[PDB]
C-alpha cells in the first residue's frame, strides 16, 4: 500500500529532530504527492508545514491516501537506531495498526526492523493561502540559529526589521539591549555566507525567541534559511529539503 524508501536515512532523522520539540503527535498524510505534515503546537502559536515530495524516495509508492498518526518521541527513539548512511524503508498496509521501518547496513549484512503503533489524531486542518510577502531574506541557516540563541539568552522577544540595506534583529532585556545587523552579501566561490533581501516595502515585526530557537533545530537540513515577513501575516521560516520543504509559521507578538 505505502512504501517510501530513503537512499540515506539521515534526512528523515534530521526532519523528525527539527519537529519533535515543537509538536508531539502528528499525522503524516501520504498520497501521490509524497508525505505531508501540518501540525500546530499545543500553544496554537506556530504551525509546521512539511512536504517530502515523491521525487526524494527511491521508489515512492502510495496506492491509497493514508494518515499515519505517529508519536514523534517514539519515532525519534526508533530513528536513533538507524545510521545516517543506512538505507531506510518505510511501509504501511491498508488500514494499518503500525508503521514499519527497516534500516539496512551499507557494509555489514545487518538489518533492523521496527514497528511503531499508530495513533488516532484529530488535528483540525488549516488552509494556507499562498502568500506574497513584503520582505524575503535568504541567509545562512547557522547564522540565523546563532543570532536566535544569542538574543534568546538576553530576552524573550526579537524585533526583525527588514529594509533594502539589510536585516536587523534587536532585543531588550534586564541585561540591556542587543542587536545583530546583517547585510546584503554576494560571494563567488564561497556562497554559503550569502545574504539576499528581496524587498518591496520595509517590514518590522516582533516574535517569540523560544519558538524561533525551536525552528532553528532544522538548521541541519539546509545551509540556507528563508525568512518571509509582511504585516497582517505570520512570519514564515522556510528550510529547503531538496524536492520538498519544511516551513514554520509564527504569529507576531501583538
Amino acid at each position: 500500500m505505502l512504501e517510501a524508501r530513503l537512499e540515506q536515512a539521515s534526512l528523515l532523522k534530521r526532519v523528525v529532530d527539527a519537529i519533535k520539540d515543537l509538536v508531539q503527535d502528528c499525522n503524516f498524510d501520504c498520497n501521490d504527492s509524497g508525505i505531508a505534515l501540518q501540525a500546530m503546537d499545543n500553544s496554537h502559536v506556530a504551525l509546521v508545514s512539511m512536504l517530502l515530495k515523491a521525487e526524494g524516495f527511491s521508489p515512492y509508492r502510495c496506492d491509497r491516501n493514508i494518515a499515519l498518526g505517529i508519536n514523534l518521541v517514539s519515532l525519534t527513539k526508533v530513528l536513533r537506531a538507524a545510521q545516517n548512511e543506512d538505507i531506510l524503508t518505510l511501509k504501511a498496509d491498508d488500514s494499518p495498526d503500525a508503521v514499519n521501518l527497516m534500516f539496512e547496513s551499507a557494509e555489514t549484512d545487518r538489518i533492523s526492523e521496527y514497528d511503531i503503533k499508530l495513533m488516532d489524531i484529530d488535528q483540525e486542518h488549516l488552509a494556507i493561502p499562498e502568500t506574497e510577502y513584503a520582505a524575503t531574506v535568504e541567509m545562512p541557516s547557522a547564522e540565523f540559529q546563532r543570532i536566535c540563541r544569542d538574543l534568546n539568552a538576553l530576552s524573550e522577544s526579537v524585533v526583525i526589521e527588514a529594509t533594502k540595506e539589510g536585516v536587523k534583529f534587536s532585543c531588550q532585556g534586564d541585561i540591556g539591549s542587543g542587536s545583530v545587523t546583517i547585510r546584503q552579501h554576494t560571494s563567488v566561490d564561497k556562497p554559503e555566507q550569502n545574504v539576499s533581501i528581496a524587498l518591496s516595502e520595509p517590514v518590522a515585526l516582533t516574535f517569540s525567541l523560544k519558538y524561533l530557537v525551536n525552528f532553528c533545530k532544522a538548521t541541519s537540513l539546509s545551509s540556507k534559511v528563508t525568512l518571509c515577513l509582511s504585516q497582517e501575516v505570520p512570519l514564515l521560516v522556510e528550510y529547503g529539503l531538496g524536492s520538498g520543504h519544511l516551513r514554520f509559521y509564527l504569529a507576531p507578538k501583538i
Partner: peptide, 10 residues
C-alpha cells in the same frame, strides 16, 4: 497570539 487567527480552518 493564536495562529488560527490567520489561517482559516478546514
Amino acid at each position: 497570539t493564536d495562529i488560527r487567527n490567520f489561517f482559516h480552518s478546514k
